Amino acid sequence: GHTNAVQRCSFINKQKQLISCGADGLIKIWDCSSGECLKTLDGHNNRLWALSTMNDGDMIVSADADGVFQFWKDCTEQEIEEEQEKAKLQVEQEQSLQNYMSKGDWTNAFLLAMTLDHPMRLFNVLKRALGESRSVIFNEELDQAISILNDEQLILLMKRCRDWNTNAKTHTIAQRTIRCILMHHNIAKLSEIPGMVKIVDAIIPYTQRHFTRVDNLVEQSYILDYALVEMDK
Amino acid sequence: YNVGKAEKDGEIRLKNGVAMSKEELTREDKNRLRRALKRKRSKAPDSTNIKL
Amino acid sequence: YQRFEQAAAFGVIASNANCVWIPAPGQLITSALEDVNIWDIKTGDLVSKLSDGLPPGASDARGAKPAECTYLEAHKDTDLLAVGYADGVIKVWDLMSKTVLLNFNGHKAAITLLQFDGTGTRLISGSKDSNIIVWDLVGEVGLYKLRSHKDSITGFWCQGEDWLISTSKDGMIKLWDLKTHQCIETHIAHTGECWGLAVKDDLLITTGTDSQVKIWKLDIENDKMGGKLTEMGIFEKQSKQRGLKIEFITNSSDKTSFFYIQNADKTIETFRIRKEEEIARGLKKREKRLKEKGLTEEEIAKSIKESYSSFILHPFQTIRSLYKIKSASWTTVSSSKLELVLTTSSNTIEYYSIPYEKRDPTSPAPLKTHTIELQGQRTDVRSIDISDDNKLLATASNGSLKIWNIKTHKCIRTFECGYALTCKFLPGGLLVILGTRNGELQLFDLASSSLLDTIEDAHDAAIWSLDLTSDGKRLVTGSADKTVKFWDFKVLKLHHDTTLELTDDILCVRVSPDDRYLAISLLDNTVKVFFLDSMKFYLSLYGHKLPVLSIDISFDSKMIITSSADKNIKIWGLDFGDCHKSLFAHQDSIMNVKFLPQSHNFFSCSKDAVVKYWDGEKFECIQKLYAHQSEVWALAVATDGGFVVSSSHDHSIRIWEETSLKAGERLMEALDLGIAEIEGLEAYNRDMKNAVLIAVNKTPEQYIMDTLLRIRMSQLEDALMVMPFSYVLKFLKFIDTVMQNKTLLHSHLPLICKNLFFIIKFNHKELVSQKNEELKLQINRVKTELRSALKSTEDDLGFNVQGLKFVKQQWNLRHN
């Protein structure tokens, strides 16, 4: 797997692994049992003539022909702990989310489904939360939550509302969410965020189509005036 | 603009405008959606061993 | 023809399932494939045998292998036994009546765990399909299903109706709310699989794939939404293999608590829970040792957390057995001693006792006081035979030769031997001869119950095959050394006579009943025939892709069968060696083929666990016999042909004895029905001043509205067009009812509007005719709320578009 001549070879991790230096300047860590390159370290731009190991390779010192030293420190347990915590935190978020939906804590549920990036839940958060509002835009707590969203947090939402706006069966939820943002944020900051304008491009035509519709439905309501005035006669 | 395919690999967005994260999808829902796609795609010697 | 039927099965003490112990050492309930054993540990005899019925081979019998029981659970007070099978079926058995009471089928895979509730009225089952179902024994129905786990359910705990903790093979631990049928907490128990789970009060212990053992405290009433399970510490057990089962026991006299961790290896590691005073004493004692070492107060505190697990847990003793352990269970707890019972994978039951005093045990190792081994064999049987009198069955296995009574099914004698390969009785039934893999020929006597003679240098390799002439004086044996050696009996001892050196390994040697022919199978895919009188080459047969495995010659020495690993039974004729027919009998390698005596009908057993009985003339398989769970290594036929006996890889010896509403219209009734409720609900009101709907469990307006959505748009207008006028008036009343429900209307405002408008257009001239003043007021209200409901929508649409335009312009100015 080395592009050029391999100049140094030393074992690390007991019999398990081997580290090698090449004239290319690449350090490749291999598995002796399987003979496969597990990791490649590239901290040099010239041939490597020296390689010093300590504590079964826990400390690796490599010297460049140019005169540069890379003191590599093993940290595998460090990263592995990090992914475990991320997964652990990750798992807690769904279970916290699901119960919020069952309990009806929508204002916080908005945060969780957003962070987990769950569209159905997110769409379900706004839909039935809006229904409770029918029973300022949505409610004081959720409206404030929408205010605190950061730019990337805002990037995700109008992507969803754009898609929701396209469908007439779901545009109404999208419109109110757009209304909340425009009134709880500095529009100047919105226009500055990259990607808003292109997402905002798609929202104009569909919104106009919805506006042209519904207006027509109110027209068809005025049949009823004819019923009242005629049936009054 | 028209709704298309998922930008993120872990999402399913239909032309209805609804996006679906695979993580929140339940197993039964995932199965039917997989079958739903399929319909869309479809029309488109050793003595010891030998003895013992 | 006549039918073959499973008369009886035996040779199994404990199959691949758990063991349930009941007090009187008392009795033990163990698994034997499809049936359940009840043993008496003291006597070592089978007390009763629990079999549903429908013995394999009957016409009513099903055409597939029976499902083996996988888990046993018995409710002591109610004297009921629940048996879980590999197919996901639960059979509740009446122990006294020895009969099935209830049958539950809700699992698609093998059942992993069963658990009666404390009161014994509800049963909880976990299966490999990752579902937990709570059954109602009194109601004979599954109350509900828990479907969050993503792999096989390894273990769970439920000592109260409120909560259930479940472990699964996906490495997950989950807490369930039995009142909401939902999972409340979710934590990753281990990096890979999670196999063990035992709970004692707040204490909770789980075992993963590795030696790591985690500790969790159970604060059910935390109600913080988190930390009902909090990981406290990790302790490493000695065994590096996975821990399968963990189960607690308390001593009533001293409140002393103990548990074990059943490992996948041959070891059980017992532990003790230290008492609070010991922990308080130990905590103080460890403080001074660190303090005198000069550690800082913050260092010593961290060290205690690092060694937190050590404070509560005390390794007590390790049980070592000769075989891999399949299951274990505490039997009795007392201050004097601690006793355990276990089952191995090698078909035996072992009972252990641990005498102890205070913290540590008295003896270095546990005491094995009892075992049940006589009625089974540790290793699978490789060859079987029947005595000429058809009374004795000798089953040669690796390390032991056991002889059985076909009637009483009780092993009469046992003889230690090597890796036995082929066994067969001698005339008179008084001697048995074995061919071992080490090249040794061993001769045994039942009356002396000992070995008569052994020939260590009989062959240079395994004695793969062995036979006798009809006179019984001459022996022919095949071995992997590529030789056939002839032997004689002279008063009893064996003398070598002649050697026939062949080209390749020999896989079978069979002598014709008339002692004229001798068929020898070779590893080169051919079977070699000689004349026994002169040993002159006669015939060679070709056609098998893979080496032959069994040869038999008809009673009249005309027809010969040959079975091989290529899954084909080929029938040959000695007159010319022509292939009369080749049969694709089984799906796997066929081990043995035997002719029925005085007939050309023959048998065939293969690795696919199927025994097939064939017609030697019509070349048709008359009957399929599905009884075995694994490979059928050996097969033997009675001299009279009354029965055929088979032993399989599953340690079982089995004997076979010889015996309409149109769309839109539905909207009319659905409309009318909820209306009567509305006036009915209103009728109750002015007084103060149905069954279907209750089943629907939705409001009449909801139910009517749900119907309207269900109607397809293409047929909506016509359904609304079929609407009778007097019925139309009621639809207006329904719209009124929707209108007071503001939220429901907003959810489905557009669809309501189109239907109303079409109806008003539909019967405009009728509506004006109606002069009911109250009907004016119903009309009037419908708008002012509708107009306001509509008017809000355009305003929101208008607000969005205007600002959305404005943001567009600002960026355009900025970038242009």
UniProtKB/Swiss-Prot annotation, chain A:
Repeat region (WD), residues: 1-42, 44-82, 92-133
Organism: Saccharomyces cerevisiae (strain ATCC 204508 / S288c) (Baker's yeast)
Domain of life: Eukaryota
Additional note from the record: Present with 8070 molecules/cell in log phase SD medium.
Location in or out of the cell: Nucleus, Nucleolus
The protein, known as: U3 small nucleolar RNA-associated protein 13
Subunit structure: Interacts with snoRNA U3. Interacts with MPP10. Component of the ribosomal small subunit (SSU) processome composed of at least 40 protein subunits and snoRNA U3.
Function: Involved in nucleolar processing of pre-18S ribosomal RNA.
Curated annotation (Swiss-Prot), chain B:
The species this protein was found in: Saccharomyces cerevisiae (strain ATCC 204508 / S288c) (Baker's yeast)
Role summary: Involved in nucleolar processing of pre-18S ribosomal RNA. Required for the early cleavages at sites A0, A1 and A2 during 18S ribosomal pre-RNA processing.
Family: Belongs to the MPP10 family.
Subcellular location(s) per record: Nucleus, Nucleolus
Name under which the protein is recorded: U3 small nucleolar RNA-associated protein MPP10
Subunit-level organization: Component of a heterotrimeric complex containing IMP3, IMP4 and MPP10. Interacts with snoRNA U3. Component of the ribosomal small subunit (SSU) processome composed of at least 40 protein subunits and snoRNA U3. Interacts with the SSU processome subunits EMG1, IMP3, IMP4, KRR1, NOC4/UTP19, NOP1, RPS4A, RPS4B, RPS6A, RPS6B, RPS7A, RPS7B, RPS9A, RPS9B, RPS14A, RPS14B, UTP1-UTP18, UTP20-UTP22 and UTP25.
UniProtKB/Swiss-Prot annotation, chain C:
An example Gene Ontology molecular-function term: U3 snoRNA binding
GO biological process, one term: endonucleolytic cleavage to generate mature 5'-end of SSU-rRNA from (SSU-rRNA, 5.8S rRNA, LSU-rRNA)
Pfam family, one: Beta-prop_WDR3_1st
Protein name: U3 small nucleolar RNA-associated protein 12
WD repeat locations: 64-94, 106-136, 148-177, 189-217, 376-405, 415-445, 458-488, 543-573, 585-615, 627-657
Function: Involved in nucleolar processing of pre-18S ribosomal RNA.
InterPro entries cross-referenced by the UniProt entry: G-protein_beta_WD-40_rep, SSU_processome_Utp12, TBC1_cilium_biogenesis, WD40/YVTN_repeat-like_dom_sf, WD40_repeat_CS, WD40_repeat_dom_sf, WD40_rpt
UniProt keywords, alphabetically: Nucleus, Repeat, Ribonucleoprotein, Ribosome biogenesis, rRNA processing, WD repeat
Cross-referenced SUPFAM superfamilies: Nucleoporin domain, WD40 repeat-like
Subcellular location field: Nucleus, Nucleolus
Primary location class: nucleus
Record keyword Coiled coil present: no
Known partners and oligomeric status: Interacts with snoRNA U3. Interacts with MPP10. Component of the ribosomal small subunit (SSU) processome composed of at least 40 protein subunits and snoRNA U3.
Family under the similarity heading: Belongs to the WD repeat WDR3/UTP12 family.
Species per Swiss-Prot/TrEMBL record: Saccharomyces cerevisiae (strain ATCC 204508 / S288c)
Additional note from the record: Present with 9620 molecules/cell in log phase SD medium.
Gene assigned in the entry: DIP2
